[PDB]
């Protein structure tokens, strides 16, 4: 997160870190046994780390649980990043309390102008590299489909939305990928892509979760 703020320990209780020896992506806890993340975060050997603030210190609220199964969206295209979503099932159910909690799925899509909270352990510099230990947060609005397409001609599908600031300075970044965009208490986005970080006229691009709720629910129901 570039241009954000320190969230506060466990104030984002659905935020997870995907660990393969090191943090490599975020995710969102959507029930006691399932995490949603970005398909471009797929790899084998994932350990889901819940209840994290400092990802380099054991502070007392962590739950570390191995993935038992990963499911990349059937129609994920790694070239275009269309359908950049994946589900991860936990080998055991997480214990849910106020510091570790699932985030509600949307029943309807969000609109341009809604403010949302975006969070993660990604890079904090736009012309630099600095990775935080503690969870960073950014409040950002959803942008219009037309400004999204204008920023990124020929690249924005119906399964993507832009959020952030056209002026630059405030964005998600490398290492936030897979993490949440939460708007009015619903998971509306997944950190997916963008040209650089926090560049002018290059907002963040997010997977549009509301298009996937039927797939998410049926997948959970059969796995
Ligand atoms: Ca920790």
UniProtKB/Swiss-Prot annotation:
<dbReference type="GO" id="GO:0007586">
    <property type="term" value="P:digestion"/>
</dbReference>
<feature type="disulfide bond">
    <location>
        <begin position="7"/>
        <end position="137"/>
    </location>
</feature>
<feature type="active site" description="Charge relay system">
    <location>
        <position position="177"/>
    </location>
</feature>
<dbReference type="Pfam" id="PF00089">
    <property type="entry name" value="Trypsin"/>
</dbReference>
<keyword id="KW-0865">Zymogen</keyword>
<feature type="disulfide bond">
    <location>
        <begin position="148"/>
        <end position="162"/>
    </location>
</feature>
<keyword id="KW-0732">Signal</keyword>
<feature type="binding site">
    <location>
        <position position="62"/>
    </location>
    <ligand>
        <name>Ca(2+)</name>
    </ligand>
</feature>
<dbReference type="InterPro" id="IPR001314">
    <property type="entry name" value="Peptidase_S1A"/>
</dbReference>
<comment type="subunit">
    <text>Interacts with SERPINA1.</text>
</comment>
<dbReference type="GO" id="GO:0097655">
    <property type="term" value="F:serpin family protein binding"/>
</dbReference>
<feature type="binding site">
    <location>
        <position position="57"/>
    </location>
    <ligand>
        <name>Ca(2+)</name>
    </ligand>
</feature>
<dbReference type="GO" id="GO:0004175">
    <property type="term" value="F:endopeptidase activity"/>
</dbReference>
<feature type="disulfide bond">
    <location>
        <begin position="25"/>
        <end position="41"/>
    </location>
</feature>
<dbReference type="InterPro" id="IPR009003">
    <property type="entry name" value="Peptidase_S1_PA"/>
</dbReference>
<dbReference type="InterPro" id="IPR018114">
    <property type="entry name" value="TRYPSIN_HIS"/>
</dbReference>
<dbReference type="GO" id="GO:0004252">
    <property type="term" value="F:serine-type endopeptidase activity"/>
</dbReference>
<keyword id="KW-0106">Calcium</keyword>
<feature type="binding site">
    <location>
        <position position="52"/>
    </location>
    <ligand>
        <name>Ca(2+)</name>
    </ligand>
</feature>
<dbReference type="GO" id="GO:0006508">
    <property type="term" value="P:proteolysis"/>
</dbReference>
<feature type="disulfide bond">
    <location>
        <begin position="116"/>
        <end position="183"/>
    </location>
</feature>
<feature type="disulfide bond">
    <location>
        <begin position="173"/>
        <end position="197"/>
    </location>
</feature>
<dbReference type="InterPro" id="IPR050127">
    <property type="entry name" value="Serine_Proteases_S1"/>
</dbReference>
<feature type="binding site">
    <location>
        <begin position="174"/>
        <end position="175"/>
    </location>
    <ligand>
        <name>substrate</name>
    </ligand>
</feature>
<feature type="binding site">
    <location>
        <begin position="171"/>
        <end position="172"/>
    </location>
    <ligand>
        <name>substrate</name>
    </ligand>
</feature>
<dbReference type="GO" id="GO:0097180">
    <property type="term" value="C:serine protease inhibitor complex"/>
</dbReference>
<keyword id="KW-1015">Disulfide bond</keyword>
<keyword id="KW-0378">Hydrolase</keyword>
<keyword id="KW-0645">Protease</keyword>
<keyword id="KW-0479">Metal-binding</keyword>
<dbReference type="GO" id="GO:0005615">
    <property type="term" value="C:extracellular space"/>
</dbReference>
<feature type="active site" description="Charge relay system">
    <location>
        <position position="40"/>
    </location>
</feature>
<feature type="disulfide bond">
    <location>
        <begin position="109"/>
        <end position="210"/>
    </location>
</feature>
<feature type="active site" description="Charge relay system">
    <location>
        <position position="84"/>
    </location>
</feature>
<comment type="similarity">
    <text>Belongs to the peptidase S1 family.</text>
</comment>
<keyword id="KW-0222">Digestion</keyword>
<feature type="binding site">
    <location>
        <position position="177"/>
    </location>
    <ligand>
        <name>substrate</name>
    </ligand>
</feature>
<feature type="binding site">
    <location>
        <position position="54"/>
    </location>
    <ligand>
        <name>Ca(2+)</name>
    </ligand>
</feature>
<dbReference type="GO" id="GO:0046872">
    <property type="term" value="F:metal ion binding"/>
</dbReference>
<dbReference type="InterPro" id="IPR033116">
    <property type="entry name" value="TRYPSIN_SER"/>
</dbReference>
<dbReference type="InterPro" id="IPR043504">
    <property type="entry name" value="Peptidase_S1_PA_chymotrypsin"/>
</dbReference>
<keyword id="KW-0720">Serine protease</keyword>
